[PDB]
Swiss-Prot record:
This is Cyclin-dependent kinase 2. Phosphorylation at Thr-14 or Tyr-15 inactivates the enzyme, while phosphorylation at Thr-152 activates it. PANTHER family: CELL DIVISION PROTEIN KINASE, CYCLIN-DEPENDENT KINASE 2. The record marks 9, 80-81, 158 as: CDK7 binding. Its EC number is 2.7.11.22. GO terms for biological process: cell division; cellular response to nitric oxide; cellular senescence; centriole replication; centrosome duplication; chromatin remodeling; DNA repair; DNA replication. InterPro entries: CDK (IPR050108), Kinase-like_dom_sf (IPR011009), Prot_kinase_dom (IPR000719), Protein_kinase_ATP_BS (IPR017441), Ser/Thr_kinase_AS (IPR008271). It is found in: Cytoplasm, Cytoskeleton, Microtubule organizing center, Centrosome; Nucleus, Cajal body; Cytoplasm; Endosome. It comes from the Eukaryota. Found in a complex with CABLES1, CCNA1 and CCNE1. Interacts with CABLES1. Interacts with UHRF2. Part of a complex consisting of UHRF2, CDK2 and CCNE1. Interacts with the Speedy/Ringo proteins SPDYA and SPDYC. Interaction with SPDYA promotes kinase activation via a conformation change that alleviates obstruction of the substrate-binding cleft by the T-loop. Found in a complex with both SPDYA and CDKN1B/KIP1. Binds to RB1 and CDK7.
């Protein structure tokens, strides 16, 4: 750690403080994350090779005196701040589309290596002045787990959590990231979180109020999952035209596929990239005030 000068705290992450820092040597500006069982070290070490333009680069791992630090490529802003700033007029559809397209490429690459994110949210989707967006903290959930509360006791949000996780599936898949990204897509479009649950049941019931209570017809095997209760209320599914106006039919079609209940049938990142919604994708440059 003597090789880095902390510049400022840029966030309180799931696992510890996140700092902007400078490599006293090279002068490189990085993000430094404070987080060790050998299994966790091996998993993190493998992430050093999971390189892609839409994945925040893991530069190095420092483990000294039993304290662990991850060193990442630095990006200047997150999607949460950008959405808050763009709220009066909303993020233009071409930019939402470019961001969704890029995020799907990051997911497709990681998922091809069977690496999950598991905790996508606006706070870990990072943007630069060039119109790129990148996913931060990919693979960390498998290495360290996803706790109920962060190191600062902050509640880890449930808003983007896939229903199979909430229903107690032990061996959930890459589909959980597609669900989270669908929730984020809806939020960019409407300027409001889609499912802002404040407990596991409120999260689950919010999903059900919009998408309908799942049953054996739409999700074969759902009634067998650990946390499924036959006493869940039965809500009817809402039309997406009500849920995400004024998104066009291509976007609604893709969203509906990203929010399928049955994880085996939820669209993959690779298939989503081919959806007609991306026929006219471009790469606009966002207005960033840093
Ligand atoms: F991914 C994260 C989760 C939670 C907290 C921070 C992060 C977080 C935030 C950033 N940069 C964005 C930024 C820059 C300056 N001020 C604020 C944010 N960065 N940059 C690389 C990793 C990272 N992780």
């Amino acid at each position: 750690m003597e090789n880095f000068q902390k510049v400022e705290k840029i966030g309180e992450g799931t696992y510890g403080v996140v700092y902007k820092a400078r490599n006293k040597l090279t002068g490189e500006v990085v993000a430094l994350k404070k987080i060790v069982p050998s299994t966790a070290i091996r998993e993190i070490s493998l992430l050093k090779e999971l390189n892609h333009p839409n994945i925040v680069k893991l530069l190095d791992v420092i483990h000294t005196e039993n304290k662990l630090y991850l060193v990442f490529e630095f990006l200047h802003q997150d999607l949460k701040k950008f959405m808050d700033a763009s709220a009066l007029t909303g993020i233009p559809l071409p930019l939402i589309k470019s961001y969704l397209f890029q995020l799907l490429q990051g997911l497709a690459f990681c998922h091809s290596h069977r690496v999950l994110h598991r905790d996508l949210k606006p706070q870990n989707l990072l943007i630069n002045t060039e119109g790129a967006i990148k996913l931060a903290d990919f693979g960390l959930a498998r290495a360290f787990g996803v706790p109920v509360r962060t190191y600062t006791h902050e509640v880890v949000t449930l808003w983007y959590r896939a229903p199979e996780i909430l229903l107690g599936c032990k061996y959930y898949s890459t589909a959980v990231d597609i669900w989270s990204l669908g929730c984020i897509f809806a939020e960019m479009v409407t300027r409001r979180a889609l499912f802002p649950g404040d407990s596991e049941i409120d999260q689950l019931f919010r999903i059900f109020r919009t998408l309908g209570t799942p049953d054996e017809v739409v999700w074969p095997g759902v009634t067998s999952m650990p946390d499924y209760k036959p006493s869940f209320p039965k809500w009817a599914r809402q039309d997406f035209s009500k849920v995400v106006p004024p998104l066009d039919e291509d976007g609604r079609s893709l969203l509906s596929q990203m929010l399928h209940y049955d994880p085996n049938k939820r669209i993959s990142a690779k298939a989503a990239l081919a959806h007609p919604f991306f026929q006219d994708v471009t790469k606009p440059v966002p207005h960033l005030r840093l």
